[PDB]
Amino acid sequence: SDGDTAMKAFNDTFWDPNAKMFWKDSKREKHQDAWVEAELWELVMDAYQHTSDPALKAELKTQIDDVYDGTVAKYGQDWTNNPFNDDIMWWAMGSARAYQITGNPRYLEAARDHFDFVYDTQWDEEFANGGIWWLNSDHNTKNACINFPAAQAALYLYDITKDEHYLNAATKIFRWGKTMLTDGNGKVFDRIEIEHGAVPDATHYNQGTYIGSAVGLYKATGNAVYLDDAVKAAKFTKNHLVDSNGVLNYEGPNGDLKGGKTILMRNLAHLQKTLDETGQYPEFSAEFDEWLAFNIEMAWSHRNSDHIVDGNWAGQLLSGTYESWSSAAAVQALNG
Numbered sequence: 001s002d003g004d005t006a007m008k009a010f011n012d013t014f015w016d017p018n019a020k021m022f023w024k025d026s027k028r029e030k031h032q033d034a035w036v037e038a039e040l041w042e043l044v045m046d047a048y049q050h051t052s053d054p055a056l057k058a059e060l061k062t063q064i065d066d067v068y069d070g071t072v073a074k075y076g077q078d079w080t081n082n083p084f085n086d087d088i089m090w091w092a093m094g095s096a097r098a099y100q101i102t103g104n105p106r107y108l109e110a111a112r113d114h115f116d117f118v119y120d121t122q123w124d125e126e127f128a129n130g131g132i133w134w135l136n137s138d139h140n141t142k143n144a145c146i147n148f149p150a151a152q153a154a155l156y157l158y159d160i161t162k163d164e165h166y167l168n169a170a171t172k173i174f175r176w177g178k179t180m181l182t183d184g185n186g187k188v189f190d191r192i193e194i195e196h197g198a199v200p201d202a203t204h205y206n207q208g209t210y211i212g213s214a215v216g217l218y219k220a221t222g223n224a225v226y227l228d229d230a231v232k233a234a235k236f237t238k239n240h241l242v243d244s245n246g247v248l249n250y251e252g253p254n255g256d257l258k259g260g261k262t263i264l265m266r267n268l269a270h271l272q273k274t275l276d277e278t279g280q281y282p283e284f285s286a287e288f289d290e291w292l293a294f295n296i297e298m299a300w301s302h303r304n305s306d307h308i309v310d311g312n313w314a315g316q317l318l319s320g321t322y323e324s325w326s327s328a329a330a331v332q333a334l335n336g
C-alpha cells in the first residue's frame with residue numbers, strides 16, 4: 001500500500017537506528033523535539049496497525065519498543081520533573097497505546113504514573129473553574145494541548161484498566177474543555193490565560209485531540225452528544241482550517257504547528273470509522289469521506305522522488321531540507 005511506501009520512506013529519511021530516535025530533518029543533525037517524538041511514536045504504532053507487509057509489520061513492532069528506549073536513554077524514565085505538562089501527557093498517552101499493543105507492564109506504569117502526576121497535581125479549580133495548567137513550573141495558562149490529550153490518555157487508561165476513575169477523569173476534563181475552550185459549536189480555542197483571557201485561535205492538532213476525546217467518550221459512555229461534538233469540530237475543521245481549494249492549511253512557520261495535521265488526521269480517522277460503522281450523520285459522512293480522500297490524494301501527489309511529502313500539501317514540489325514533523329502528516333494520512 002501507499003501507507004507502507006510512505007512509512008518506509010519516512011524511516012529511510014528520518015529514522016536514526018543508533019540513537020533509536022527520529023532526526024528533526026533530512027540533514028540528520030539534531031534529533032526531534034521530545035513531545036513531537038511521542039507523536040512520531042504514535043505514527044509508528046498507526047502504521048504497525050495498518051500494514052500487511054510481514055517484513056514491515058515485524059520491523060514496526062520492534063520500532064515501537066525502540067522509540068521508547070531511545071527516548072528514555074536521552075531523557076530518562078521519570079518525566080515528572082519536566083516543566084511542560086503537555087510533553088508529559090503526550091508521552092503518557094503514547095505509553096498507554098504502547099501498553100495496548102505490547103502488553104509490557106513498563107508502559108502501563110509509564111502511562112499511569114505520568115497521567116496521575118499531571119491530573120492529580122495540575123488540575124485546578126481556582127482559575128477557569130477547572131482545567132489542567134500548561135506548565136508545572138509556572139501557573140499562567142490552561143491549554144487545549146494539555147487538556148484534550150489528557151482526556152484521551154484517561155480514556156486509554158480506562159480501556160486498559162476498566163477503572164471508572166479514569167472515565168470520570170476523562171469526562172470531567174472534556175466537559176470543562178468544551179465549556180471553557182470551545183465556542184460550543186466545534187471551534188476549539190488554544191488556551192485561556194490568567195492575564196489575558198481566552199485566546200480563540202484554532203489549529204489542527206487541537207481540533208484533532210478534541211475530536212479524538214469526543215469519539216472516545218461517545219464509545220465509553222454511550223452519550224451521543226459526544227459524537228455530535230466531534231462532528232461539529234470536524235465540520236469546523238473542514239470549513240475553516242483549509243485553503244481556498246479545501247486542502248488543509250499549512251500551519252508553519254511555528255514549529256509545533258507545522259506537523260499538526262499528523263495529529264488531526266490520526267483523530268479524523270477515528271471519527272470516519274465510527275460514522276461508517278454506526279451509519280450516523282450519513283450526509284456529513286459522505287461529504288467528510290470525500291474531503292478526506294481529496295486531501296490524502298493531494299498530499300500523496302506532493303511527494304518527492306524519495307516518497308517524502310513536505311507539510312505544504314498544496315504547494316510546489318521543493319528540494320532541499322525536509323523536516324520529520326512536517327513530513328509525518330502525509331504518512332499518517334496514508335496509514336488511516
Ligand SMILES: OC[C@H]1O[C@H](OC[C@H]2O[C@H](O)[C@@H](O)[C@@H](O)[C@@H]2O)[C@@H](O)[C@@H](O)[C@@H]1O
Binds near residue numbers: 199201202257
Ligand atoms: O494559533 C494558536 C497559537 O499558535 C502558536 O502557538 C502554538 C502552541 O504554542 C505553545 O505550545 C502553546 O501556547 C500551545 O497552546 C500553542 O498551540 C502561536 O502562534 C500562538 O500565538 C497562537 O495562539
